């Protein structure tokens, strides 16, 4: 009834000003009431069965004053034959359809915006209506309805052109690569409701984009060109300024939008295609070519910008900037490491220390470009321990960083390796060679054995080790014993831990055994009152008559000081809570250690000692565990047996001037030395009294090449060790106590500290009794800080004692000195004697039945003792 009153009023409102009114009726909304209709003149035309040509003719030609109400049970007839379409467009429809369902299913109840929603009649289904209700904010207007109807087609849940664009640009990145068209199906569905006009309109109102015939391809050109222009080459901007966004306010939007696209890693993703689009359009990188590299710290636009700066600096290093462009050399580095492509791809970050550590090496080279010179061995040593190993570090580092740019096969720099290596073989090594010869020529320390101030290796356990008992805690610390170490490990490992706490050190160093190979370094440190060379061992050695090699001998050297030893096969994280017990007298305890020596006399890896500067370096910024203040542990005990070299090419002339008469008692002969009796120096051999300098039971002199010259290449030639100087005999008596373990770490399970007892079995006999936790092995950098929830259990973690919650903060010395009585409360004889029982130490921070060690109790109660 009232639907008919409003049908009458709606038809009256159409027929007041249009002679012809449509009414499509697939819903058949007023099928019965057709003649109840009050209209002056109006003729209903059910068009469905009509000759629609002859009824257009009826409407237009035949009856030019007659009013008409057209009807169908479907939409228009096919548009190719829709004679009526021009009328259908310029005229009007009576809405037999009801807006209220749509309005309230949008939320939007609004009987005004109803007329635009009526202009959107073909948009609607319950899904879109209610999704739009999910987005509606009923102070809507036609433009917000438009923007939101865009947003509704676009799948976002806020209606803003940047975010819409982010969606559409997702759909563009799809459409450009991976079998999609819902960008253009969205655009077409926008156009279906006039909204695509509103899209490319509000792309001016918000994004300052226009074109006469726009596409997301053209916008992506114009907008790429914006931040491309803002980051363009300052030497070559203008020729790339001319393909940009339609307005500078759009450029500003586009910069804030591209700053967003960078920062908000939601939408980084569209640079998965811009950097592919944006070369072959103009090849502007090939137009830029020789533009300044270090200034481009600013610009992150493409792979090509980056590769410009690469090749512009590869240029500067085949032009081979020994003479150093220092502050421009710096200008780029950290900025690139922090900038987008670097942040995507670490090998690019490596470029900037392939730079930074060459920036070292060539600054270093410049300041010491004739090699180095100082007045005597003490003043050369003084300068060495400031700096004159940093030329190892820097070369090593930057080559490995260059090679870390190259990590993915990107050899995008290669041949300047051959320049900088020629610095090595043919200059760096080549020169100071001669220079510290002129000092040993000045001094003849050969058989003139004193040097100002600096300490000596020749009597260490006899006159230093037990003299470390000057603080009342001290009698003992654990040793790691290592083969081959270019001294700068023992500056990088410590200086790159100047950041650490009571994990601590002091800048100090001292002079080693003069023949630089492993086992004579070992002998002077084998625990002793005297150091032994003896016949039958040759290049194997002793102290107190016990020897540097063979496992049974190796644990036995130490028994004179209660000790024992363990392999590099075993130390690594050598077995858990039993570590409290196997050791408790041992004034000395040993671990063997060998990664770089296993690259050395392994002659296939001598040419690969830059790969020791990789594989061993990934172990050697690291080392310790088992020491920092907790379950009591105290000091460093490792130091250099010998230094060594590396160089990236076949040798110079200065790399191999050679021997005089080799000694008959050759104790070892080697790639860079010989030990043996009666040898004073020569033009390119240093030769002097090992018997003065070594403190070992040894008559010898030495043969050493003066300068970077060399001998019989046993186990190396580009890697060598043996002779007089500090990439061979700087020994790191840095004051040290603990570090950052990864060296010598792999094979055993974990040893998560050790903790329990000071008892045979964990067996207790007082009515309340001491679990005497013998503090012996802390945390450190693999072993545990874990709070201990200590209680006795059966096999299945079921309680049979009181429980204690335990943690520590101590580093105290002398292994006999260190009990903690965690006094547990005990339950008679509940223990089933056919079954095993244990002290659970929970990880008190996760409280599982985490770990346990063996207990049996059946109390002889207190009165049996007292």
């Amino acid at each position: 009834t009232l639907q008919n009153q409003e049908f009458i009023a709606g038809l009256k409102a159409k027929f007041a000003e249009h002679r012809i009114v449509f009414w499509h009726d697939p819903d058949k909304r007023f099928l019965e009431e057709l003649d109840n209709l009050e209209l002056e003149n109006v003729t209903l035309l059910d068009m469905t069965d009509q000759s629609q040509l002859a009824v257009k003719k009826r409407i237009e030609i035949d009856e030019p004053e007659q009013q008409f109400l057209l009807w169908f049970p479907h939409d228009a007839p096919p548009k190719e034959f829709d004679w009526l379409l021009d009328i259908r467009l310029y005229s009007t429809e009576f809405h037999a359809d009801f807006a209220a369902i749509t309005l309230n299913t949008l939320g939007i109840p609004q009987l005004g915006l109803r007329e635009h929603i009526q202009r959107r009649k073909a948009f609607f289904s319950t899904k879109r209506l209610s999704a739009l209700k999910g987005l509606v904010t009923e102070q809507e207007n036609e433009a917000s309805l438009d923007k939101k109807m865009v947003a509704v087609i676009a799948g976002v849940k806020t209606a803003k052109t940047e975010e819409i664009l982010f969606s559409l640009i997702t759909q563009y990145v799809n459409q450009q690569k991976d079998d999609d068209s819902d960008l253009e199906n969205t655009l077409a569905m926008l156009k279906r409701h006039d909204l695509e006009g509103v899209l490319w309109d509000i792309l001016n109102q918000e994004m300052g984009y226009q074109a006469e015939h726009p596409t997301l391809e053209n916008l992506i050109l114009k907008l790429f060109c914006t931040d491309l222009s803002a980051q363009a080459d300052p030497q070559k901007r203008e020729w790339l300024e001319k393909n940009v966004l339609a307005t500078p306010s759009g450029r500003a939007s586009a910069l804030a939008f591209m700053v967003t696209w960078r920062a908000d890693r939601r939408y980084k993703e569209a640079y998965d295609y811009c950097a592919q689009q944006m070369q072959d359009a103009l090849r502007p990188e090939d137009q830029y070519r020789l533009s300044s590299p270090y200034d481009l710290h600013e610009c992150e636009t493409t792979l090509s910008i980056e590769q410009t700066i690469i090749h512009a600096l590869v240029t500067q290093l085949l032009e081979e900037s020994t003479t150093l462009d220092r502050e421009a050399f710096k200008k780029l580095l950290s900025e690139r490491q922090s900038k987008y492509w670097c942040q995507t791809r670490q090998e690019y970050c490596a470029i900037y220390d392939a730079l930074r550590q060459a920036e070292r090496l060539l600054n270093l080279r410049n300041r010491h470009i004739d090699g180095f010179h100082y007045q005597d061995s003490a003043t050369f040593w003084k300068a060495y321990c400031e700096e004159l190993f940093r030329f190892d570090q820097a070369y090593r580092l930057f080559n490995e960083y260059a090679l870390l740019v190259h990590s993915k096969g990107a050899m995008i720099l290669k041949s300047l390796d051959d320049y900088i290596e020629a610095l090595y073989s043919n200059w760096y090594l080549a020169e100071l060679s001669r220079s510290w010869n002129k000092v040993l020529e000045t001094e003849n320390r050969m058989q003139e054995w004193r040097i100002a101030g600096v300490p000596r290796q020749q009597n260490f356990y006899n006159e230093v080790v037990k003299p470390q008992f000057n603080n009342p805690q001290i009698k003992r610390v654990f040793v790691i014993i290592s083969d081959a170490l270019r001294y700068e490990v023992a500056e990088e490992l410590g200086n790159q831990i100047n950041t650490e706490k009571r994990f601590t050190a002091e800048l100090r160093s001292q002079l080693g055994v003069l023949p630089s190979y492993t086992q004579l370094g070992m002998a002077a440190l084998l625990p002793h009152d005297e150091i032994c060379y003896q016949p039958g061992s040759g290049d194997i050695v002793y102290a107190d008559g016990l020897s540097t090699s063979g496992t049974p001998n190796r644990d036995t050297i130490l028994k004179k000081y209660k000790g024992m030893a363990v392999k590099s096969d075993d130390l690594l994280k050598w077995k858990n809570q039993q570590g409290r017990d196997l050791i408790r007298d041992y004034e000395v305890v040993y671990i063997w250690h060998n990664t770089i020596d296993a690259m050395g006399d392994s002659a296939s890896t001598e040419e690969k000692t830059f790969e020791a500067c990789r594989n061993a370096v990934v172990e050697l910024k690291d080392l310790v565990t088992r020491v920092i203040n907790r379950l009591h542990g105290t000091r460093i005990i490792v130091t250099a047996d010998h230094g060594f070299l590396f160089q990236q090419q076949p040798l110079s002339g200065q790399d191999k001037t050679t021997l005089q008469i080799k000694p008959d008692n050759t104790i070892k002969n080697h790639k860079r030395f010989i030990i043996g009796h009666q040898l004073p120096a020569d033009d390119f051999c240093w030769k002097g009294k090992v018997a003065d300098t070594a403190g070992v039971s040894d008559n010898s002199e030495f043969l050493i090449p003066k300068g970077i010259q060399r001998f019989h290449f046993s186990g190396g030639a580009r890697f060598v060790h043996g002779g007089a100087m500090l990439q061979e005999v700087c020994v790191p008596v840095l004051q040290v106590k603990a570090l950052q373990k990864t060296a010598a770490e792999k094979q055993p399970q974990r040893r998560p500290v050790d903790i329990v007892k000071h008892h045979p079995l964990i067996k207790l006999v007082n009515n309340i009794d001491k679990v005497s936790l013998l503090q012996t092995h802390p945390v450190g950098e693999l072993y545990e800080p874990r709070t201990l929830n200590i209680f006795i259990v059966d096999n299945a973690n079921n309680v049979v004692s009181g429980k204690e919650r335990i943690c520590f903060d101590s580093d105290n010395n002398t292994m006999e000195k260190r009990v903690r009585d965690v006094t547990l409360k005990l339950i008679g004889a509940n223990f089933n004697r056919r079954n095993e029982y244990w002290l659970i130490l929970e990880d008190a921070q996760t409280e599982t039945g985490y770990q346990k060690y063996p207990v049996i109790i059946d109390l002889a109660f207190q009165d049996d003792f007292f």
Partner: protein, 199 residues
């Protein structure tokens, strides 16, 4: 009134009595056709103006009358030739039949019946009515391609309900993908030359 379309419509009579129209002076040695894209909903204004122009222009020049939808109605009542070309089946089989039922009104042949209605070459022009009723299969640039078979050198004017960008013709809500160029712009879309009735 829209004064811009009323001005452009008054320039039908101005171009007709100016030299270029009846002398065909684009190059002169040409069929002197002309172009008149107009705002698509202004049907009534163009129809009624040309119903008036049939009464007014005989003060100046010689012509006759056409009605756009009447010319179609005079030969069809529905797809019509569809219903008639159903006869093709026995003659050559179902291929020609189906292609002639589906692929309707090839526009070349629109020419002759207007030359039977009006002596086109003897007129200075012909005036249309019903105008933007264009949505059968007849298209503006196609009608302008067809009638040059029979108009001779006599001018024809492409009244079209929509736009012609100086190249792309399009009616109504945006249709067709085609151009016309032998015809001169009677008055273009744009500039003060498109709007010369100030106060």
């Amino acid at each position: 009134i829209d004064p811009v379309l009323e001005y452009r419509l008054s320039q039908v009579q101005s171009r007709i009595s100016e030299e270029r129209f009846l002398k065909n002076n684009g190059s002169g040695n040409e069929i002197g056709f002309w172009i008149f894209d107009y705002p698509a909903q202004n049907e009534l204004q163009v129809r009624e103006h040309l119903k008036y122009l049939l009464r007014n222009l005989e003060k100046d020049h010689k012509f006759a009358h056409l009605n756009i939808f009447q010319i179609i109605v005079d030969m069809l009542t529905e797809r019509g030739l569809f219903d008639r070309v159903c006869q093709q089946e026995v003659k050559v089989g179902t291929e020609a039949l189906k292609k002639q039922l589906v692929g309707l009104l090839n526009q070349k042949k629109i020419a002759d019946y207007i030359a039977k209605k009006v002596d086109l070459q003897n007129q200075e022009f012909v005036i249309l009515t019903g105008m933007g009723n264009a949505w059968p299969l007849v298209r503006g640039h196609e009608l302008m391609s067809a009638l040059q078979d029979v108009m001779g050198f006599t001018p024809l004017l492409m009244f079209y309900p929509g736009t012609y960008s100086g190249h792309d013709l399009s009616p109504l809500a945006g249709i067709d993908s085609r151009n016309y160029y032998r015809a001169f712009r009677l008055v273009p879309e744009s500039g003060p030359a498109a709007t010369l009735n100030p106060r």
